[PDB]
Design a protein around this motif. Sequence first.
Motif, PDB file in Angstrom:
ATOM      1  N   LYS A 293      21.161  33.057  16.813  1.00 13.64           N
ATOM      2  CA  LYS A 293      22.127  34.151  16.803  1.00 13.64           C
ATOM      3  C   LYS A 293      21.428  35.500  16.695  1.00 13.64           C
ATOM      4  CE  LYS A 293      25.507  31.430  14.277  1.00 13.64           C
ATOM      5  NZ  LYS A 293      25.589  30.360  15.309  1.00 13.64           N
ATOM      6  N   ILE A 294      20.407  35.595  15.841  1.00 10.57           N
ATOM      7  CA  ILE A 294      19.615  36.819  15.768  1.00 10.57           C
ATOM      8  C   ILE A 294      18.905  37.069  17.092  1.00 10.57           C
ATOM      9  CG2 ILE A 294      17.758  37.996  14.537  1.00 10.57           C
ATOM     10  CD1 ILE A 294      18.528  35.917  12.183  1.00 10.57           C
ATOM     11  N   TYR A 295      18.431  36.000  17.738  1.00  7.24           N
ATOM     12  CA  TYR A 295      17.764  36.155  19.027  1.00  7.24           C
ATOM     13  C   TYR A 295      18.714  36.718  20.076  1.00  7.24           C
ATOM     14  CZ  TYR A 295      15.181  35.082  23.279  1.00  7.24           C
ATOM     15  OH  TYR A 295      14.539  35.169  24.493  1.00  7.24           O
ATOM     16  N   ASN A 296      19.953  36.224  20.107  1.00  5.86           N
ATOM     17  CA  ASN A 296      20.933  36.719  21.065  1.00  5.86           C
ATOM     18  C   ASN A 296      21.391  38.136  20.759  1.00  5.86           C
ATOM     19  OD1 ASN A 296      21.016  34.441  22.744  1.00  5.86           O
ATOM     20  ND2 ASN A 296      22.481  33.403  21.397  1.00  5.86           N
ATOM     21  N   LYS A 297      20.957  38.712  19.639  1.00  6.28           N
ATOM     22  CA  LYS A 297      21.277  40.088  19.297  1.00  6.28           C
ATOM     23  C   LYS A 297      20.129  41.052  19.567  1.00  6.28           C
ATOM     24  CE  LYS A 297      24.861  40.172  15.765  1.00  6.28           C
ATOM     25  NZ  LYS A 297      25.656  40.459  16.993  1.00  6.28           N
TER      26      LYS A 297
END
Length: 327
Positions: A293-297
């Motif tokens: 999720k952090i990566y997709n942000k």
Amino acid sequence: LHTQVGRGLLGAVVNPLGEVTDKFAVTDNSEILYRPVDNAPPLYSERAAIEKPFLTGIKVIDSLLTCGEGQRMGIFASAGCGKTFLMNMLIEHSGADIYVIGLIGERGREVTETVDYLKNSEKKSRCVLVYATSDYSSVDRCNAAYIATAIAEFFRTEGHKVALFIDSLTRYARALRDVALADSLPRLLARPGKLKAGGSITAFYTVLLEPLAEEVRSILDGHIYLSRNLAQKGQFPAIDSLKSISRVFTQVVDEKHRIMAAAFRELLSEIEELRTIIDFGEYKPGENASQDKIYNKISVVESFLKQDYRLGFTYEQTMELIGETIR
């Protein structure tokens, strides 16, 4: 010991002897008065508490490093980190009444690039430029800083919202160092601020990174750190928000701004740690949902941080953008 001030200097280029050598704009007003360059700082009962934001139109600054009217902010960068280009953005996209620029740079072609830019700026009718090249003495290079500050002080007493730029404090310190060869700061830097009975001087001081930075870091009300590694990555402005601060931040923004700024900073810190996890070859997609999720942000926050230097953002646009990023 005395210098030229007044609205007649708007659009003029001032030298270390206080005389006009060029114009980048001509103005209706010819008002020219005379004041001493060394004036005492406002007595603490004349200063107002910094409580109103000095919006810069720059997303990273107005959201996470929000300046206040009357604050003196440091800009720490090594050569080639776009410190001059960031100063150009601060002039274009802020909303000050009058801009006073003090260049203690040294080569000759230095100053005319600034005169060239002010010649084509939409703020040209309310800018004053003071300069001092290497061909001038160390006393003259110093006096350029006092003259730029004195001009800003007169406009503040008239009630104007003044923005002052001193580039650089290092080059200034070199010239100040040679006078000792035969402590103007804090006295130099205690003059900006917001007057209870008058306007304000919001000051930006450039510090060249290669002692001096340690000394002025404790005196100012915050600092913007331009790191070369975000610039070689292609991120402009190269402001490392996690290593920068405005210490009047909590006093100049409301609580919804505060909670959003805190949440965005947690996201930034988690992104760089995920980045070092990526570089270590330890990151696998689908292995850890929190990392994914952090990566997709990462893309949407890089979308928020970067800013075309010809574009300015209102406070509402900045808070709307940051809120949709941390959602």
